[PDB]
Amino acid sequence: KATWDIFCSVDNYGDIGVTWRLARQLVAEHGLAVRLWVDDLADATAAAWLGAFCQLPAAYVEAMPSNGLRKVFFFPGFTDKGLLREGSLLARRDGFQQSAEARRAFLQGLGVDLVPGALLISLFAYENPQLGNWLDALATADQPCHLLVPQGRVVAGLSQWLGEGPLHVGDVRTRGALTVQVLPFVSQDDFDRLLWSCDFNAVRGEDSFVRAQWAGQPMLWHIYVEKLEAFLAHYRCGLSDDADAALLGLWRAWNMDFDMGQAWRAARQHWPELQQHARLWGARQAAQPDLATALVHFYRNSL
Ligand SMILES: Cc1cn([C@H]2C[C@H](O)[C@@H](COP(=O)(O)OP(=O)(O)O[C@H]3O[C@@H](C)[C@H](O)[C@@H](O)[C@H]3O)O2)c(=O)[nH]c1=O
């Protein structure tokens, strides 16, 4: 087996999130001997002029997605110049979402009592100066909302909105139509089960951004608060004028401080269109070979 060496350091997850995902895939789907040299805090993984792959274990080892098409270094894009996608991910997604008890088991395994008839929204982002306006919109809606919030950089402003004491793992609180719930940091695979379970997934960063695209449900992105509108140029292509406008107002507002209430309600006026659009994007994106295959076939043909 060929030898591959990856090294990630660290602003935190996302660097290890991408490297830990890629390292398992090159072992599992390509039978490679890879060692992830993490420099900072399912396996078989041993964790310029003119990713290290050649084997040398010397101490002084110096013994040797987002323009983007022109840079052929990392080479991770949305066009024919890709994304990390496990071979059986889409199949594992469909079997999970088509089994009613599997959906019930995972939710109940995380201490979540689903509000009957409620829209289920996962939110995982940085500090957004518009969280308060969005939660005011959900709380004032005439249909219930169940919000699942993993432990992270958003529970701070979440607490400042509810106004009570500090919130940690386990606390679940209701205001009007919105019921807020704080989740722990589970496993990467269970985070996929989370995305597959909710009707709307608010992600951020790099990997969860793509993981939610494979989830196939309506989603929202929070980029390290330039490259936002370049993502929407491809994402918005198929929708009608009313749905296109509602998706632009939704995503720009979450990143440029425009009213989260007006945008959210506008997008909800076109939910069947947005639901189908999210499914069609995942199927279109998955039609291209994944990144792990793109890294392997390139090395097999040398250069
Ligand atoms: C919420 C949650 C996330 N995760 C995973 C999702 C990914 O694997 C990883 C999250 O990383 P990302 O999705 O890329 O979001 P991120 O914000 O953590 O990553 C980003 O940080 C910013 C400062 C910069 O854009 C870069 O540094 C980028 O790495 O954590 C879990 O495994 N379990 C969880 O419960």
Descriptive overview:
The PDB classes it as transferase. Keywords: glycosyltransferase, transferase. The assembly is monomeric. The entry is titled "Structural basis for EarP-mediated arginine glycosylation of translation elongation factor EF-P". The chain has a domain at 89-286: Glycogen Phosphorylase B (Rossmann fold, 3-Layer(aba) Sandwich), CATH 3.40.50.2000. Helix content is 43%, strand content 13%. The protein contains 12 helices and 8 strands. The protein has helices at 15-28, 89-97, 100-109, 131-140, 155-162, 188-197, 207-215, 228-235, 241-256, 260-268, 271-286, 291-300; strands at residues 3-6, 33-36, 119-123, 145-150, 172-175, 178-183, 200-204, 219-222. The strands form 2 sheets. Strands 5-6-4-3-7-8 form a 6-stranded mixed sheet. The protein has a two-stranded parallel sheet with strand order 1-2. Helix 4 (131-140) links the parallel strand 3 and strand 4 (145-150). Helix 4 (131-140) crosses helix 10 and helix 9 runs antiparallel to helix 10 (260-268). The radius of gyration is 21 Å and the shape is globular. The structure holds 2'-deoxy-thymidine-beta-L-rhamnose (TRH). Residues 11-15, 17, 124, 150, 185-186, 188, 191, 204-209, 224 line the site of 2'-deoxy-thymidine-beta-L-rhamnose. 2'-deoxy-thymidine-beta-L-rhamnose (TRH) is lined by residues 11-15, 17, 124, 150, 185-186, 188, 191, 204-209, 224.
